[PDB]
């Protein structure tokens, strides 16, 4: 991808960071209040917190919806978008074995070395693990 956009234009204006968060000012700022209990991953030293939240139809095993949070680089937004599209309409099988290559490929030809480029891989992995736990099956998880 020549342009994800990497820069992210127009009227963002510094990444999707600002656009998402908010609340402005308010002097009571902090992440609150609902959460669905799905996977969350974030490094404060890397400045990006990613959260993929799946919904899963138990009966067909199909990922009904999956929506994302992207923080950090604006390059990452496009990867997150495209992955969630693919994953929806696709079974649990697809939503597992999470790449790795997928994140790398979207941005450019895969470098085969990605240090804190995206935590998106981790976010979704946490999410499906959580799903398996709650429905009871930690032996398919291990």
């Amino acid at each position: 991808g020549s342009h994800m956009s990497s820069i992210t234009k127009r009227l963002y204006h510094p990444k999707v960071i600002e656009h998402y968060t908010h609340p402005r000012n308010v002097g009571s700022l902090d992440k609150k209040l609902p959460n669905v209990g799905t996977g969350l991953v974030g490094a404060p030293a890397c400045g990006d917190v990613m959260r993929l939240q799946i919904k899963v139809n138990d009966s067909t095993g199909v990922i009904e919806d999956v929506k994302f949070k992207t923080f950090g680089c604006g390059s990452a937004i496009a990867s997150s978008s495209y992955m969630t599209e693919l994953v929806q309409g696709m079974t649990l099988d697809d939503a597992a074995k999470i790449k790795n290559t997928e994140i790398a490929k979207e941005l450019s030809l895969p470098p085969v070395k990605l240090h804190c480029s995206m935590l998106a891989e981790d976010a979704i992995k946490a999410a499906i693990k959580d799903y398996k736990s709650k429905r009871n099956t930690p032996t398919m998880l291990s």
């Binding site: 991953v41 490094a43 030293a45 999470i98 790795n100 070395k113 240090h115 981790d122 946490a126």
Partner: protein, 121 residues
């Protein structure tokens, strides 16, 4: 920091949070077994007289009590366990770690428990 994959790349704070170990590249089995083997080697001052590494073949001398020798079988289900303790077992991967095909449980768990059960009394 940058390069290569996969353990090296992480920022070292996503460790607690779910990651995939990966084969890297598939030699992997020998390394994992070696780790288990070291645990077995010592923590008993009165048992486990010798651990031998003879390159590919592997002997583990263990004192008076049923003795088993485990080593890597050449690919055809690549672990052989010799045991007059509960008899033969065979193992295949089910989630990137070896799971017994006749107990339904990883080999490392059996070893840990069995050696340390001796250390007790």
């Amino acid at each position: 920091v940058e390069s290569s994959t996969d353990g090296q790349v992480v920022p070292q704070e996503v460790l607690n949070l779910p990651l995939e170990k990966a084969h890297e590249e598939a030699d992997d089995y020998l390394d994992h077994l070696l780790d288990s083997l070291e645990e077995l080697s010592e923590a008993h001052p009165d048992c486990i007289p010798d651990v031998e590494l003879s390159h590919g073949v592997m002997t583990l001398e263990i004192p008076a009590f049923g003795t088993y020798v485990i080593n890597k079988q050449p690919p055809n289900k690549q672990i052989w366990l010799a045991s007059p303790l509960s008899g033969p077992n065979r193992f295949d991967l089910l989630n990137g770690e070896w799971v017994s095909l006749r107990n339904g449980t990883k080999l490392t768990d059996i070893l840990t428990e069995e050696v340390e059960k001796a250390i007790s009394k």
